[PDB]
Amino acid sequence: IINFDTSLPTSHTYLGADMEEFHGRTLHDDDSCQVIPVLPQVMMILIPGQTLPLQLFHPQEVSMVRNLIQKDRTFAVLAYSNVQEREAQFGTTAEIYAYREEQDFGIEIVKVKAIGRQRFKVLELRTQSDGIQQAKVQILPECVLPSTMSAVQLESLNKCQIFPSKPVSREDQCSYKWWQKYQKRKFHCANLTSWPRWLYSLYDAETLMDRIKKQLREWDENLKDDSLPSNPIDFSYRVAACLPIDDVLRIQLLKIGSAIQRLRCELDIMNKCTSLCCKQCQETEITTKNEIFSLSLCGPMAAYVNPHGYVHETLTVYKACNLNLIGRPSTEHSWFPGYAWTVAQCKICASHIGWKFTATKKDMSPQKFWGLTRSALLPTIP
């Protein structure tokens, strides 16, 4: 990744440049009951901190979004266990931070960009006369737990609980001789209990984050320590968003209230090897986890909107196996500026898998990469 600004895909320039931006925050009280409108067409599982673009065509969602503009700009995204019967027990709250209306083709179109804020539980699925669903919502809490040694630590050792800063920045391998010192000094009060030091390390947020960072840097070598968030909750949400997993695993990760449990589950998910295969055939391999790399500031998987308002969750990979290419390169409505695209379908079952992006110039790096949609991929765990 050289001479390509990874900040470009995050701003979503293809949608527009003169969007109306609202700065603010509206956080609901914990364990509170609320009524929030539901978008009828979205079928995506939004993790807090993720960005969602939307194009709205029908008059009723236009009017509902217009009403939402001054009423706290909050709508609910429902995580459908099975999308056919529209039954959901959990969901997420999305806040609007960019919006704009157009009058092209003689009809009104509203473009919206939203970010996930909070999790909730579905109580009552009320339906209105105008086709917009109103949901009874209970706001789930974020559990912040103190250090495991806060209940046992000696007071005389409280001054030694603060460590000198992590040694001179390493770039690869990360020889520690420090994580050992950190384990020895932070959990020194472990001999006052029935459990050893490494068990308490298995429930430490910093160590889990370091392990996750090492495993992520194994696959993509261009990660920097400051690219990931320094807060356990934000880090866990970002990692859950970036993992190539199916819907049930994402729902299970969303059901967890504690960041430490989420980090442990994410490590367990990463440990088991996965290979991405075509969903229709289930017998042809498309790509492996080793070729997953991050061309965007928000990981190798993001949500984008096509010219007709349909949302694809695209995964950026280096090498794609067994994909047929049909069409000519075209730069219209490309989610990655400076790249064209050609549609790619499975060589066997001819189902739509994704696209192939080819750079227009010759000084761009990477010259070519493939973007595959999540809904056409299934994780194969041997």
Binding site: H308, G327, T342
Partner: peptide
């Protein structure tokens, strides 16, 4: 001109349009 809605431009042929149409549903 003629092209898909669940995917990118597919205007190679009139046949390709409806091929992609029943393909996308399946």
């Amino acid at each position: 001109p003629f092209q898909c809605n669940q995917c990118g431009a597919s205007f190679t042929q009139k046949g390709n349009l409806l091929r992609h149409i029943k393909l996308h549903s399946g």
